[PDB]
Design a binder for this molecule. Structure first.
Ligand SMILES: Nc1nc2c(ncn2[C@@H]2O[C@H](COP(=O)(O)OP(=O)(O)NP(=O)(O)O)[C@@H](O)[C@H]2O)c(=O)[nH]1
Ligand SMILES: [Mg+2]
Length: 161
């Protein structure tokens, strides 16, 4: 069996824990519990490949940062600053990995909310510059939660080629 080490990064409160908890335990946590360094493991079938997902839910670990094979760079569509911080998280990932091509996926969370300040056009333009997919998600309605994590694994498969 193949293991995939995934790291979820992003500014505080964008929904990193809610996205991971939806993927692992299939429910939406409505309360805001401040995360330190939560880890998770889960057996799933992705495109027919049985694989283990080792997921670190970082706070807004250098071990997971060095061992991480793919990175979910998450922002909230109602949080302009979190979208701006994406550049800083990507630079740190490229720094600790010393690679200009690191498997990443850009996630715009909280797309169920009507208080948007980051347009879909902005995020797709940013993702186009990075050469990474962009997924709109809602941990509340579970929209795009599977697609976000599964697309990251496909990006890892493409990188391992
Ligand atoms: N409406 C809505 N609320 C969401 C969504 N995702 C998370 N939230 C809410 O936003 C708050 C923060 O979510 P959380 O998962 O804790 O964010 P975080 O990125 O893990 N925070 P931290 O970096 O401090 O650990 C919670 O109240 C949660 O219910 C979403 O898709 N839609
Ligand atoms: Mg958290």
């Amino acid at each position: 069996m193949t293991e995939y080490k995934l790291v979820v990064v992003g500014a505080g409160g964008v929904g990193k824990s809610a996205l991971t908890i939806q993927l692992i335990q299939n429910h939406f946590v409505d309360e805001y519990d401040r995360t330190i360094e939560d880890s998770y493991r889960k057996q799933v079938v992705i495109d027919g490949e049985t694989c283990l997902l080792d997921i670190l839910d970082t706070a807004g670990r250098d071990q997971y940062m060095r061992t991480g094979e793919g990175f979910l760079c998450v922002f909230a569509i109602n949080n302009t600053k979190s979208f701006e911080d994406i550049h800083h998280y990507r630079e740190q990932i490229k720094r600790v990995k010393d690679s200009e091509d690191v498997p990443m996926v850009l996630v715009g969370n909280k797309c169920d909310l009507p208080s948007r300040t980051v347009d879909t056009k902005q995020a797709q333009d940013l993702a186009r510059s990075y050469g990474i997919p962009f997924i709109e998600t809602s941990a509340k309605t579970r929209q795009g939660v599977d697609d976000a994590f599964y697309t990251l694994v496909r990006e890892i498969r493409k990188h391992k080629e």
